[PDB]
Amino acid sequence: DWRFLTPVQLTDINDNQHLITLDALGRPITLRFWGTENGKMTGYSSPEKASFSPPSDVNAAIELKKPLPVAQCQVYAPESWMPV
Amino acid sequence: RQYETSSLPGRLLSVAEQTPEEKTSRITERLIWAGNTEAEKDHNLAGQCVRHYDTAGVTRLESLSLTGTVLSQSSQLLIDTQEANWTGDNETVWQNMLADDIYTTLSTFDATGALLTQTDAKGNIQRLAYDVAGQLNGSWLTLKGQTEQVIIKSLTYSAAGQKLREEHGNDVITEYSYEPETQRLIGIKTRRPSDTKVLQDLRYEYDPVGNVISIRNDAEATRFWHNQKVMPENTYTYDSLYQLISATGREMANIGQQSHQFPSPALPSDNNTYTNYTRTYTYDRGGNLTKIQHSSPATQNNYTTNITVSNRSNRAVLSTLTEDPAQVDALFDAGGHQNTLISGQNLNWNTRGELQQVTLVKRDKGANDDREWYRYSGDGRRMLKINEQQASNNAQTQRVTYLPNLELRLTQNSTATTEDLQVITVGEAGRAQVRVLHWESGKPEDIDNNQLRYSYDNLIGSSQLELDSEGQIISEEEYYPYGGTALWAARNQTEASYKTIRYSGKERDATGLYYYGYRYYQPWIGRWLSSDPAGTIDGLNLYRMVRNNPVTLLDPDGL
């Protein structure tokens, strides 16, 4: 990701892709990986097929439904300390 | 050792060794490594050792997960009469050193890498479920050709991640009580909801450090207790160095003196009783246990174990091998391995310091010595246990092969196979392990097939109560603090004969010797059979028992 000069898509030795999405200011938001295990592909659906919109609020994020095509989706609330 | 050349990464290729008596080295280990070819990419094997030749046989890696774990692995043992000597460069040759009996296990993991499904080498399948916290919350087992059974109906954990509630497939429920101030187990309650019967009700009283100073069992004495109901506390006394000095508990009246021979279980028809005993432990300045004084006034068992400790090492034996501190070292080899277990039983240590053989009965030059012998894999794991009786009309061989989650107990008489039993393990020993006994041959007349054994473990993982699929008692056992048997009873001696997990979850071998991974333990002494490898022990006494305090295995993080 050339905005940060940090790696975001990693190709393994094996047939295995490991990808992350960063937000502005570069914090990791999502993780996906996929590849073959026994000559056939499994893992997480790639992002060009399985789109995903991370939740905004933390309280909103808590209530997600099961078919979530992502690992370790991050939600940040660095500003939760300010009164609003 | 032989490593790859500079055109390569420099990974290990082989291990060779030579004893002083030999002219050449032998190849005991050899590693064939995966490259970066398409097949390897397909099975996620690139760069991995895929064919590992060792001292036990050959281990073959067939498939890895996207998470880096094992999905498919297979293996073969060495022919009993063929040593590992994987010379030359031809696997065709190496194959002829092996049995053609290949075992394979298969697995399925989630994205996290938690194990979800495991197929053993006979086709039996374990299935695991996890909760929202990623914790194991239940478990099932399907035997090959059978339906799926529930082994664990439910698990609940505390805030600390500790097991709080356990519900077994046999309807037995175990509740765990933790002291909330310290987050440590304070009690165990095992009950049958079918008849609201409490089988175990334990409490652990501790000093300020965390040593258990008393164990109470509020459960009632069971069916094997002839007109007895209430048990005393297991009181423990410790010194300033926290060595166990004294302890109390119950023992079978007919248990006799402690030795390497395991006692017969009491049966419910015997009408035996148990006595109240105290045992005292004396230690020298190096932490060596020098004397064990038994006292059980009901039978006036005043048996004393006298230990002779070397005056130039921390090595020690019972007085039966020698009385002289100047001679004690003569009983050990150069690496600190014990040469003889008990008088007459010789110990053969191999080139890796592992116990290769135990002579059980010394005979003439006609009849062979009874013996036990072993094979270990290239990680020090025991893979094969062979018990050879040489009696001409009773030369029974008990061949036990260890596989992940599977123990194969093959028994033959001097002419032919008498029993073929698969033991399927679900869970870890000392951690509420449940076993299934599946026979392909030789099932005893009074034993149902696909028999379940539910182990109800104590504070340190010793197995005290064994229940069946109906929540009934199969067996009951109490131990001396150092692992001897204080009390043993069972519903059926036939069933009793199959319990091998006894102390701190470890296997009691035929000789009375316990197996602990890399070392063996002698409960009649309170010492390790051989010195531990330097650097794995922080103290100086390489034969010392876990801090002379077997009551509390205070080994946080497994250390």
Q: Is A38 in contact with B71 (Cβ distance < 8 A)? A: yes
Nearest chain A residue to B65 by CA distance is A37
* CA–CA min distance B49, chain A (Å): 14
Compute the residue count for chain B.
559
| Residue whose entry in the numeric block shows the structure tokens 């279980």 | B265
Report in angstroms the alpha-carbon separations of B96 from A76, B76, B82, B100, B454.
Answer: 61, 11, 10, 9, 41
Give, in degrees to the nearest 5, the angle at Cα B262 between B257 and B263: 70
Number of neighbouring beta carbons within 10 Å of residue B52: 20
* CA–CA min distance B105, chain A (Å): 15
- The Cα–Cα gap between B424 and B408 comes to 9
CB pairs below 8 Å between A and B: how many? 42
Give Cβ neighbours of residue B101 (< 8 Å, ≥ 6 apart): B76, B77
Q: Strand, coil or helix: what is B269? A: helix
Nearest chain B residue to A37 by CA distance is B43
Q: How far is CA B273 from the centre of its chain?
A: 29
- The Cα–Cα gap between B500 and B496 comes to 9
Q: What are phi and psi of B495, to 5 degrees?
A: -75, -35
Q: Residue B421 burial (CB < 10 Å; 0-12/13-18/19+)?
A: buried
Give Cβ neighbours of residue B559 (< 8 Å, ≥ 6 apart): none
Tokens read off for B246 = 């004294």
* CA–CA min distance A82, chain B (Å): 30
- The Cα–Cα gap between B520 and B530 comes to 7
Nearest to B185 by CA among B457, B499, B549, B518: B457
Q: Residue B227 burial (CB < 10 Å; 0-12/13-18/19+)?
A: exposed
Q: What are phi and psi of B38, to 5 degrees?
A: -60, -35
Q: Is B43 in contact with A38 (Cβ distance < 8 A)? A: yes
The DSSP result for B28-97, as a single string, is EEEEEE--S-HHHHHTT-TTSEEEEE-SSEEEEEEEE-TTS-EEEEEEEEBPTT------SS-HHHHHTT
- The Cα–Cα gap between B55 and B77 comes to 9
Note every long-range contact of B224-228, with CB atoms under 8 Å and residues 24 or more positions apart, other chains counting. Answer: B224/B266, B224/B267, B224/B268, B224/B272, B224/B476, B224/B489, B224/B490, B225/B273, B225/B274, B226/B270, B226/B271, B226/B272, B226/B273, B227/B273, B228/B273, B228/B274
B68 interfaces chain A, CB cutoff of 8 Å: no
Q: How far is CA B225 from the centre of its chain?
A: 28
Nearest to B275 by CA among B298, B256, B259, B292: B298
Q: Which of B66, B69, B112 would you mutate first to test chain A, the one with the most A CBs within 10 A? A: B66
**Structure-solving method:** cryo-EM
Nearest chain A residue to B70 by CA distance is A37
B219 contacts B229 by C-beta, under 8 angstroms: no
